[PDB]
Amino acid sequence: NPLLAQLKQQLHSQTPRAEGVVKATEKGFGFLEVDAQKSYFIPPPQMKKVMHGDRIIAVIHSEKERESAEPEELVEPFLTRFVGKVQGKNDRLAIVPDHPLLKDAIPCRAARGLNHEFKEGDWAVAEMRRHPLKGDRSFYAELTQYITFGDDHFVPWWVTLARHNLEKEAPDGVATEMLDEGLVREDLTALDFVTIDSASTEDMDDALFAKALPDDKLQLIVAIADPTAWIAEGSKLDKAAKIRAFTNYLPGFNIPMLPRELSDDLCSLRANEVRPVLACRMTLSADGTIEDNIEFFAATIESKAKLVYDQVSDWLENTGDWQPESEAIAEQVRLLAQICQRRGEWRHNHALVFKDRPDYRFILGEKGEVLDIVAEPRRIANRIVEEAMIAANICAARVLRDKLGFGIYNVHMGFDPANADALAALLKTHGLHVDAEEVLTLDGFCKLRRELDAQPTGFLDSRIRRFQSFAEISTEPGPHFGLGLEAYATWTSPIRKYGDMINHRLLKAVIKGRPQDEITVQMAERRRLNRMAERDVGDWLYARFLKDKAGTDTRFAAEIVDISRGGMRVRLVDNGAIAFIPAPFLHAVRDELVCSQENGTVQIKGETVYKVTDVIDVTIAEVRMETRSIIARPVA
Ligand SMILES: [Mn+2]
Numbered sequence: 001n002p003l004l005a006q007l008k009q010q011l012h013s014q015t016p017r018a019e020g021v022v023k024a025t026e027k028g029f030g031f032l033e034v035d036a037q038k039s040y041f042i043p044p045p046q047m048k049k050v051m052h053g054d055r056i057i058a059v060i061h062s063e064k065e066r067e068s069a070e071p072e073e074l075v076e077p078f079l080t081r082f083v084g085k086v087q088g089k090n091d092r093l094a095i096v097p098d099h100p101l102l103k104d105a106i107p108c109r110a111a112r113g114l115n116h117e118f119k120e121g122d123w124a125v126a127e128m129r130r131h132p133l134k135g136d137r138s139f140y141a142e143l144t145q146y147i148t149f150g151d152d153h154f155v156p157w158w159v160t161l162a163r164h165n166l167e168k169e170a171p172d173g174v175a176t177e178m179l180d181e182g183l184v185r186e187d188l189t190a191l192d193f194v195t196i197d198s199a200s201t202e203d204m205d206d207a208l209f210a211k212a213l214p215d216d217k218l219q220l221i222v223a224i225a226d227p228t229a230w231i232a233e234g235s236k237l238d239k240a241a242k243i244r245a246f247t248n249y250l251p252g253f254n255i256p257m258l259p260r261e262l263s264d265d266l267c268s269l270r271a272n273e274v275r276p277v278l279a280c281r282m283t284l285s286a287d288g289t290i291e292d293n294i295e296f297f298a299a300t301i302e303s304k305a306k307l308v309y310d311q312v313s314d315w316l317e318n319t320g321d322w323q324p325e326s327e328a329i330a331e332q333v334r335l336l337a338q339i340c341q342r343r344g345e346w347r348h349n350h351a352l353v354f355k356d357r358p359d360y361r362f363i364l365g366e367k368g369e370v371l372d373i374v375a376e377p378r379r380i381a382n383r384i385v386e387e388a389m390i391a392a393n394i395c396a397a398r399v400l401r402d403k404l405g406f407g408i409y410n411v412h413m414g415f416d417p418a419n420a421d422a423l424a425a426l427l428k429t430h431g432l433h434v435d436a437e438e439v440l441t442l443d444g445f446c447k448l449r450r451e452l453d454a455q456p457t458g459f460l461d462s463r464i465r466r467f468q469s470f471a472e473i474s475t476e477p478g479p480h481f482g483l484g485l486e487a488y489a490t491w492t493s494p495i496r497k498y499g500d501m502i503n504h505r506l507l508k509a510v511i512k513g514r515p516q517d518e519i520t521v522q523m524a525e526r527r528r529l530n531r532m533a534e535r536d537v538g539d540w541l542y543a544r545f546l547k548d549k550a551g552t553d554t555r556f557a558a559e560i561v562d563i564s565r566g567g568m569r570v571r572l573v574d575n576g577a578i579a580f581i582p583a584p585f586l587h588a589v590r591d592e593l594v595c596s597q598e599n600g601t602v603q604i605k606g607e608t609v610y611k612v613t614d615v616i617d618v619t620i621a622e623v624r625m626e627t628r629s630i631i632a633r634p635v636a
Pocket of ligand 1 (some may be wrong): 204
């Protein structure tokens with residue numbers, strides 16, 4: 001009855017359940033990772049109800065000792081929109097999802113309107129449609145897009161773009177005429193300005209200059225291209241850039257935020273071409289600070305030298321190759337050098353000095369093969385443009401703070417106020433004077449940051465950094481905890497950064513007389529997707545580059561980046577590749593070996609033998625092309 005029914009329902013609700021994530025491997029039974037040590041065993045027949053990565057509620061089935069979990073509710077499904085390689089016969093297609101841990105092929109079927117005959121091996125986008133835990137018969141996906149075919153060498157670029165639903169083209173750009181508002185655009189032409197960029201860039205978005213002043217003072221002029229002089233709010237090209245947010249840069253291939261006809265010409269600041277530029281005046285001295293000596297003002301220049309980072313850095317030491325032809329550009333290089341080497345001193349004493357992990361560059365043939373993977377050096381000329389840029393992005397942050405309290409600012413809070421006392425405890429182990437009170441305040445943050453520098457290695461720094469939040473983007477001004485900036489505002493690259501383009505329009509309002517709520521929402525999101533994309537293509541290419549090295553005695557220095565319970569992750573110093581080293585390769589006696597994810601150490605016979613940050617030599621044991629995984633072993 002009613003009666004019987006009601007009883008059964010209550011007996012049903014009160015029964016033991018746990019919520020967790022399914023962790024399957026190449027076995028039949030899996031586990032529900034509940035938490036710290038709670039993991040339940042999921043038996044083979046029950047494994048077929050769920051997918052590795054699914055978040056589920058399970059009924060807990062009572063047994064004498066070893067308990068069992070029976071999948072009952074799907075909380076959060078692992079797959080929704082995904083990519084994979086198609087298989088099967090004409091009318092019975094399946095798709096193996098592109099993920100190390102999901103071997104099983106999912107029945108599928110093309111959408112409405114999709115007409116492509118899905119060959120075998122075809123890469124497809126799919127959307128999950130059926131799940132056994134939703135009362136469905138079995139797993140069912142819908143093929144919604146064709147990416148490319150199986151043997152396609154360009155698989156790495158296309159699949160990555162498709163899985164993140166990123167554009168693969170520049171926006172269509174009808175380039176209409178240039179605009180007018182109240183442009184009292186000045187005249188800094190005659191005075192010879194210089195670009196300092198890489199070898200192959202057809203767009204230089206920045207120019208530089210300095211003046212012979214009287215007593216102990218300098219005068220930097222940062223000159224940045226004017227995209228907003230042509231593009232207008234609402235404009236088609238305005239609305240496409242809003243969607244894209246950032247230029248997506250990948251190994252050998254970029255997806256421009258803006259049409260090339262601006263980038264390469266109209267906005268580019270070439271050689272001896274008159275170009276409408278937005279500039280910034282400033283003065284520095286022996287310590288190096290600027291006050292009410294900064295004006296932001298539209299102008300126009302005729303750049304008189306296209307200058308390469310290495311040629312420039314060659315001369316700023318002495319070498320055998322290059323000489324600046326002019327006495328104009330030559331003296332103007334000495335200018336910017338003294339500027340740079342003095343400007344570093346203000347940020348070491350009032351901010352946070354940078355050590356920006358060495359960008360790796362892929363060198364590819366016209367067919368996509370990896371020839372090499374060099375690491376981009378940070379010589380002096382790089383630190384010249386870096387310095388200038390840094391200083392010149394600073395000036396905007398203040399200005400736009402005073403006029404509006406609007407801007408596109410980058411807000412790094414530092415440590416999560418939750419982990420707050422979790423941290424002052426940690427250092428307390430390491431024996432480090434950290435009052436939980438001050439901590440949060442910038443003064444504390446940056447004073448702690450100093451003490452870390454004083455350490456033998458970067459171990460403790462790696463530790464504490466599991467405690468901070470991520471740099472965000474906001475409309476209000478904030479502090480750049482990570483940079484040591486009071487406030488930070490980017491206008492350095494309006495051509496690649498919508499934020500910097502929005503800043504430009506705000507920077508125009510300054511000279512003259514609020515970016516909407518969800519703008520930052522999708523600016524953050526695109527930067528994430530852009531970062532994952534770049535990383536995923538690189539993972540493919542590393543696997544291809546290193547393949548022939550597997551089983552060989554080639555050694556590679558590798559820094560240990562993360563310790564897990566089953567082993568440790570290293571990044572090869574020379575190329576940046578990430579490899580895994582399983583624990584039975586670290587020591588032959590398992591009970592003698594401890595890997596703590598939580599302590600960033602590996603102990604052998606009670607002692608610490610490796611820690612996050614260490615640099616050891618490794619050989620390449622295995623490279624799995626299907627999954628792009630690289631296994632390494634320490635040199636013995
Ligand atoms: Mn540049």
